[PDB]
From a paper:
Gap junction intercellular channels (GJIChs) facilitate direct communication between adjacent cells and play important roles in various biological processes such as cardiac contraction, electrical coupling, cell differentiation, and death. GJIChs are formed when two opposing hemichannels (also called connexons) from adjacent cells are docked, each being composed of six connexin (Cx) protomers. Cx43, also known as GJA1, is the most ubiquitously expressed connexin protein. We identify three different N-terminal helix conformations of Cx43—gate-covering (GCN), pore-lining (PLN), and flexible intermediate (FIN)—that are randomly distributed in purified GJICh particles.
The protomer-focused conformational variation analysis of Cx43-M257 GJICh particles in the POPE nanodiscs (condition 8) showed six protomer classes in three distinct conformations designated as GCN, flexible intermediate NTH (FIN), and PLN, which accounted for 37.3%, 22%, and 40.7% protomers, respectively. In the FIN conformation, the density corresponding to NTH was slightly shorter than that of GCN and PLN and was more kinked toward TMD than toward GCN. The map density of the FIN hemichannel sub-structure contained substantial noise from different NTH conformations as the FIN protomer class was the minor class (22%). Nevertheless, the map densities of the TM helices were homogeneous and similar to those of the PLN hemichannel sub-structure, including the π-helix in the middle of TM1 and large gap between two neighboring protomers (the membrane opening). When the final model of the FIN protomer was superimposed on that of the PLN protomer, we found only a slight movement of TM helices in their cytoplasmic regions and a 50° kink of NTH toward the cytoplasm. Another superposition with the GCN protomer showed a 20° kink toward the extracellular region. This kink, together with the movement of TM1 and TM2 during the GCN-to-FIN transition, half-blocked the CHS1-binding site and formed a hydrophobic path from the site to the membrane opening. Although the NTH densities in the FIN hemichannel sub-structure were strong, they were not separated from each other. In addition, four N-terminal residues (residues 2–5) were not observed. These results indicate that the FIN conformation is relatively flexible compared with the PLN and GCN conformations.
Author numbering:
A (entry chain E), B (entry chain D), C (entry chain C), D (entry chain B), E (entry chain A), F (entry chain F): 6 to 113, 148 to 235
The structure:
């Protein structure tokens, strides 16, 4: 039954869309659950600042990481999977209506490409927007020493992160994967557009 | 078999009801299990007050959070999924009775729209009630410093929360999702009512 | 296959029995695993008494909670699901015997209502018994300060519980659900009895 | 498919064997995973003795509990499920051989009751043996204060257990369940033996 | 479908091979996941030596246990399941080739016993090799007091293990199971060899 | 259904490819989830250096392990499974196109070996590249004493690892498995190439 269901969902799509779904499944969803989630396991437990003031660790950790990268990548992978599901539901409803019309009439370039172009444009726009936001907030490296200058701590305090090399490696890896997806969408659009 | 079962459950519904079920599944149930649950992981472990009195942390944490937002959203998502299931069970029983009457007679605007309107009204009422309760209790922001004035602590004590920016972001996100659902229900009601 | 199996288990029952099974599944089993289990997560870790005697915390925590509410509700939900399963197995065996007699004879008010009445009476009796036991042991509120008077501690010691508001809310919620089930069983009995 | 498989495994057995399988599933396997496992969660973490000698806690905890009750009940539930599976595999092989002989000959009181009696006798023997062992080692109660007299601790030390009331309740509960099973096996044997 | 798949995998094998597969599944894989894994849960957390030198605990724990028994039993259960899978894949390929030859010719003592003998010999050899290795490294008991004589600790230090009785019981239990399997393989070989 | 699906995925492949898939599944994916993951459980919790400077442990642990071996093996097992999936998807699309041409024409040495050779060459290249990287970074042993010379610690500090024998054993084991796979790929290539 599983095989048949798979056929039903992915049997009517482009080959570049198929390899995009492959790089979505085997390289993003598989990587996020297996290995990169445990690297952000002991985030707040190993974060250690250098003072004796009670509660300076919480405000300095909050000012260091406004949002952890795992939940940011989860929101990124949710907001780029919605238009594909919308296009699939629309083409499923249209295929069902045309099949019903075929069954009722056997007993007696259009909206699809428009929705396809719209879905591809929204996917590329959300990808480049999330890349610009991540470049604006964090950069693409983590230093082992962070300087904190927030109340109620005294003037300046030093805090030390937890394993800042492995997270740098995984940040660069997800950046490479997102750039590959952004290039592949434009490749697919120019492959489908110049056949007119 | 899975595909067939899905057809059986969702093949007789409105398209706005279909996109409401989509925003129920992919945006509420998927978001609650994956990312936002781990943000409320170390709630009571990282909560730290500034005193030496034994047991002031427990009473100040209790007075700060009367109920955590995760269980509140779980009760919200339970109390708005009951009338949809009731409508589906009622239309399933009516469809089974009409199919049995059709099978026994082949060998020889009404209650449905009423229940549909009732289910939509109860869904919108429970949504706006839970929004008013959450606006009354917490507001829509978390400050990093909380002042506690409860026995057996001395006069006033300061307590520091854990990562109050990320929880503010997720609170605003769930507020936007609930407002979108509340608008979509009224859109569906006015779409189905003016066809008379 | 799943759908068919469901049909097989629940296709021959009363409609009040169907909504009782609905309030059993979606309101008791679903609520116990999702949200209310994590509220009793850090029970013994956050329980803190006010002394320096080694081991007073264990005996005072034992005298405070003779049995936690989660395991008590699990025993309550087990002891009220046995007679329904017994009635279903009995009617399945009787239906199989009558179907075998029909197949062997096509090639050529009674015990059921008695067992139904017995199952409903045992369900209501166990419900009111567990409610009386929970009213006798704990009451329906948790105070934030408990006084302990047990050896080997000195004369009287104070202990502070962990988040006593949220547990009060969930205790009141499960009480309301159990009272609704107890009323619904009597409603079903009077609905099925006055048709004679 | 599930339903059919269930039919295949349990369609040829005695009714007392059916209710024995019911009390095996819903009362032993279901109870061990859900509630009683979490009661033995923080066993060695909350065990606290009264001294300053390093390492006295480990030897006194070892002399207190030679084997925890959870693993003892797991071994008990394994050693009483083997003869039922052996009888089922034997009757499956005999049914397959007789069905093959029937298919090869349509184209042209004995060993079963012996194995049934042997399986019932071995089940009752292992039940009463495990009950005698548990009565010999622990008794049927846990005191909150234990006296330890083992090297390298000094002369006598006091140790305090963790929640000794709840474990007493569950020990008495499993004792009642095992006595009910032991009585039911003898009831089934005398029900099947006096029909000769 | 499950039932059919099971038939497909185990329908062509010896009865002693069937009871060997039974003692492989219900007594090794079932026992390792359920109960004996939690006994080695807090291994390094409860291991406590008697000194104040920083880092003596790590080197003394390393010299005490070169490899924990759980991973050793996992490697033992992997290295004795490979030849059975190899024999099954070989007989599956040979059965497929003979079935293809039968289908292409209906439209118009040998290698198997050799591989069977080879698989049984390799299984018995790896079993007795792992038993000799475990007898050489650990013995078959754990003492509660271990003497450590390794740098950078001072001259001799005492360390105390965690619950050394329960692990002794489980070591003796797995030894009995492995000896039963080693005897059963030779019984199966002499049962299949003297029929010539 | 499962069996059929398995047939569909693996019924058209080489026998050396089949035993390569066997050594991929039963020896890499099975070993990584069961036993070797728990050995790297308490990595940063048991790592202990010998100083009193706050935060020297984080920078010395970061300089010791730039990336843990578990995530490195996960990236290794991902980057060698992509060309097999690409070859399978390509031969599936070609088989579907040829089957469609056969169905449309019944109603009225090439690209495959090229892709096979390309997939085998890329697999062997990525294997030897990951082996060279692991030989360059870590070596194939872990010492129990590591010397750290990084700011903001003083001149030289000693740090002690956690269980450095078991990790050495598992590193040697995965090295042996990878060398066996690298030899088997060349064996398969020379077996398929000299048949011309």
């Amino acid at each position: 039954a599983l095989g048949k269901l798979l056929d039903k969902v992915q049997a009517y799509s482009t080959a570049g869309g198929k390899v995009w779904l492959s790089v979505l499944f085997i390289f993003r969803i598989l990587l996020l659950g297996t290995a990169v989630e445990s690297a952000w396991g002991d985030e707040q437990s190993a974060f250690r600042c250098n003072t004796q003031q009670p509660g300076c660790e919480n405000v300095c950790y909050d000012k260091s990481f406004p949002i952890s990268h795992v939940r940011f990548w989860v929101l990124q992978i949710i907001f780029v999977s919605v238009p594909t599901l919308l296009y699939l539901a629309h083409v499923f409803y249209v295929m069902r209506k045309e099949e019903k019309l075929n069954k009722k009439e056997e007993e007696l370039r259009g909206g699809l490409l428009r929705t396809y172009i719209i879905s591809i444009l929204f996917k590329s726009i959300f990808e480049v927007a999330f890349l610009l936001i991540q470049w604006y907030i964090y950069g693409f490296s983590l230093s082992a020493v962070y300087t904190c200058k927030r109340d109620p701590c005294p003037h300046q305090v030093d805090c030390f992160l937890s394993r800042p090399t492995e997270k740098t490696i995984f940040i660069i890896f997800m950046l490479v994967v997102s750039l590959v997806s952004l290039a592949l969408n434009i490749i697919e659009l120019f492959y489908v557009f110049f056949k007119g």
